[PDB]
């Protein structure tokens, strides 16, 4: 589990609208909320 | 008519989630918004 | 085709509540999203 790939919902040029974008983070960078869900 | 106990529906995290917390405010601190509804 | 009058809503006194409001903007101040849609 050196690197984890996943995405999140983030704001766009229009504040009301939102987009889904993928990013890569190291395993130790994030922590598990609990399955398959994490936060910084 | 001096102390008012109640809770306000506010969110800290989990954007699509709502959780209440109870706090006590003085009567003059909060003004009526309209019955049983107040505002800072 | 020089000044556009139109409606929208944004923040208000209370975060939860909403209010529809109207304002007049110049044609070159805003740009279309595409029909009958614009943004600053």
């Amino acid at each position, epitope marked *: 589990e050196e690197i984890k790939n996943c995405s999140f919902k983030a704001t766009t040029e229009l504040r009301d609208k939102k987009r889904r974008e993928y990013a890569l983070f190291y395993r130790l960078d994030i922590v598990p909320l609990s399955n398959s869900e994490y936060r910084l | 008519e001096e102390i008012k106990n109640c809770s306000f529906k506010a969110t800290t995290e989990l954007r699509d989630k709502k959780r209440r917390e109870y706090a006590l405010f003085y009567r003059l601190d909060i003004v009526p918004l309209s019955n049983s509804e107040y505002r800072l | 085709e020089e000044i556009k009058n139109c409606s929208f*809503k944004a923040t208000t006194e209370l975060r939860d509540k909403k209010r529809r409001e109207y304002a007049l903007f110049y044609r070159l101040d805003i740009v279309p999203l595409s029909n009958s849609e614009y943004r600053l």
Partner: antibody
Amino acid sequence: EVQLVESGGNVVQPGGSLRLSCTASGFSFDDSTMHWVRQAPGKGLQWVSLISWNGGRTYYADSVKGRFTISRDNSKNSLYLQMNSLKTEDTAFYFCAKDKGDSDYDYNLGYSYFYYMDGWGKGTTVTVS
Amino acid sequence: YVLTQPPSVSVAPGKTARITCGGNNIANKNVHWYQQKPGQAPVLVIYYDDDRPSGIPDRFSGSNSGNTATLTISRVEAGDEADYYCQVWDSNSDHVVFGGGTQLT
């Protein structure tokens, strides 16, 4: 006190089209989002479609995203949901329900829209073939 | 994302009903219960798991914590002989899912 009325249902055939009219009054559509669900006999509720005041947040359910479109207008305050390419397992009573449209705004996170039906209509009818 | 409501429940008059709206990590999502009577459209009875709308019988409360979302009823009466449904909004999966209901005696 609000009322929702729907009409236009009748016998239908697979591969055909039907026009459904759903007028309502008592609450302005300017700040109201309308939902759509169906209630087949012996089964639970199923989400059909969602629509916002003008556009965006018009998300559709996974199983009914094929060629289904929902449109809204402010001139006469009504809604439509035209049935197209009817299957042989999508027959049920379609229900349109009002939504409160509550929201919330944090400078960092942004607008967050909550969804939960408040008012419900009488109900429509569908009969494949 | 799906719910795991019980298939049926039996509560004789004078007892309390413990209807549950099962769901994985449902404590992180709000649950709204509905009454689905036969012959007329459903009416919302609970929203945000604590609030309560107007024009409703009193003593209608619900609890939502852990892995189970439970609805509380008291002095059960034959007028409520219908099916209960719970609604939850999901953004990660990007769809709304309703449970299969639970038959009542």
